[PDB]
Design a protein around this ligand. Structure first.
Ligand SMILES: OC[C@@H]1O[C@@H](OC[C@@H]2O[C@@H](OC[C@@H]3O[C@@H](OC[C@@H]4O[C@@H](OC[C@@H]5O[C@@H](OC[C@@H]6O[C@@H](O)[C@H](O)[C@H]6O)[C@H](O)[C@H]5O)[C@H](O)[C@H]4O)[C@H](O)[C@H]3O)[C@H](O)[C@H]2O)[C@H](O)[C@H]1O
Ligand SMILES: [Ca+2]
Length: 415
């Protein structure tokens, strides 16, 4: 008779997986009915923001770790600490500490104190390569541990870029990376970032940042190891990767079900190519599962969040359905070692989590508007109409004003 609203986002394979697992929850808890509100990833932020603006908050919902402090200040998230402590069996200490701590807040800083959510997952963003394509081309396979240098990466990408059917037109390319999701690793491995150490000053005008951004754009425009601008418009590079047209493309654990369904070639994971630091870099994503401060059924709502995040039965179902890696550290370690589950080097996901993955810069700031502004007007750089140097000099003060406002608005909302 109890009814909960569960609001979340996902690609089609993720929507199916979580709907299936919510049904398992309902089977286990016959007195609870869960009403689903689900959107595409791109639609989610707008829809959640509207719910919160109207103070019509779903009982259980996904949220961005960068919004944690703002959600606490505006009393959006229930303090679920005591419900989790009283729960039968589940020990959050089995779960990735990096994941759990993103949703703790002690009143002053993130990473400690009361629980205001549970981790949906950790989302290490690995680099995949098309092994079928390498072996057909006679090119030595990438090393599973030692990153390519940037020059080595371009060299191999050039070797892979060719006319394979002999009609005179290129139909296979080295790569086709999306700057929204893959620029970070190049910036970070080149010893740069969007913001400084203190997370209060924009640093995109760092020569190291400029070099990374120019290199990124140059893959398409200068080195020409990607589909052309027109070709990517015709069919985007994610789809071209699925069809076996690209040598390299990123892989997150949420991709695995989609790739199981659509990818017919053999692929495996490798470290990202490394810039001046010689150390690979990429991001580790996460989403939180939160409970509305205003929920009429806090026990049942926390029980649902726990089922998805930490319950061994719920987690097993999500992992079996190939939309994430295990939240339990020990389960993830034995998962990675199981050779019957592909990719062969899915250990790379854990290496990202444990060693060379970083957080998105917005996880450190009170809101992410300053960062969104960088990407909003980036495309002319990517299409070779504006230099990286010219763009970051123009973007920097716009970004800085927004970041300054985030910092101030924190001070005001936290009183
Ligand atoms: O800019 C050029 C564009 O390319 C063309 O569009 C094609 C695009 O390709 C398709 O997208 C493929 C997917 O994109 C990458 O995945 C990125 C995002 O990950 C998924 O979410 C997983 C989720 O996020 C992780 O957390 C990350 C962050 O961490 C926190 O700070 C914050 O809260 C999180 O946001 C979690 O760990 C994990 O659960 C999203 O689904 C996806 O967007 C992968 O390559 C593919 O999965 C799609 O069709 C187009 O977007 C166009 O021409 C042009 O726009
Ligand atoms: Ca051809």
């Amino acid at each position: 008779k109890i009814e909960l609203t569960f609001m979340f986002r996902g690609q089609p394979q993720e929507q199916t997986a979580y709907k299936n697992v919510v049904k398992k929850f309902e089977e286990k808890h016959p007195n609870v009915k869960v009403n689903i509100v689900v959107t595409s990833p791109d639609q989610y932020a707008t829809k959640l923001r509207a719910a919160i603006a109207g103070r019509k908050i779903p009982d259980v919902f996904y949220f961005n770790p960068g919004e944690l402090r703002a959600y606490v200040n505006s009393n959006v998230l229930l303090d679920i600490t005591k419900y989790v402590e009283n729960s039968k069996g589940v020990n959050l200490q089995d779960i990735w500490e990096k994941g759990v701590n993103k949703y703790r807040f002690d009143g002053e800083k993130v990473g400690q104190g009361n629980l205001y959510g549970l981790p949906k997952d950790l989302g290490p963003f690995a680099l995949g390569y098309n092994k079928t394509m390498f072996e057909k081309a006679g090119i030595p396979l990438p090393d599973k541990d030692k990153p390519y240098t940037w020059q080595e990466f371009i060299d191999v990408c050039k070797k892979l870029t060719k006319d394979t059917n002999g009609d005179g037109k290129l139909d296979q390319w080295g790569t086709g990376l999306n700057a929204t999701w893959t620029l970070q690793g190049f910036v970070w491995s080149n010893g740069a970032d969007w913001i400084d150490e203190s997370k209060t000053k924009v640093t995109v005008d760092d020569p190291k940042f400029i070099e990374a951004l120019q290199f990124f754009a140059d893959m398409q425009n200068k080195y020409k190891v990607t589909p052309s601008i027109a070709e990517a418009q015709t069919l985007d590079t994610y789809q071209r990767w699925l069809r076996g047209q690209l040598g390299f493309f990123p892989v997150g654990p949420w991709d695995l079900a989609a790739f199981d369904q659509q990818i017919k070639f053999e692929y495996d994971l490798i470290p990202w190519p490394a810039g001046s630091t010689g150390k690979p870099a990429t991001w580790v994503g996460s989403l939180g599962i939160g409970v509305s401060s205003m929920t009429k059924h806090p026990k049942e709502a926390v029980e649902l969040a726990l089922y998805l995040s930490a319950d061994p039965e719920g987690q097993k179902a999500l992992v079996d359905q190939r939309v994430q890696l295990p939240n339990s550290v020990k389960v993830a370690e034995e998962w990675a070692k199981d050779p019957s589950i592909k990719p062969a080097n899915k250990q790379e996901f854990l290496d990202i989590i444990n060693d060379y993955g970083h957080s998105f810069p917005t996880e450190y700031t009170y809101n992410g508007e300053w960062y969104d502004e960088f990407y909003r007007n980036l495309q002319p750089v990517l299409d070779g109409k504006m230099s990286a140097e010219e763009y970051v000099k123009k973007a920097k003060p716009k970004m800085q004003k927004l970041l300054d406002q985030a910092i101030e608005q924190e001070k005001q909302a936290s009183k």
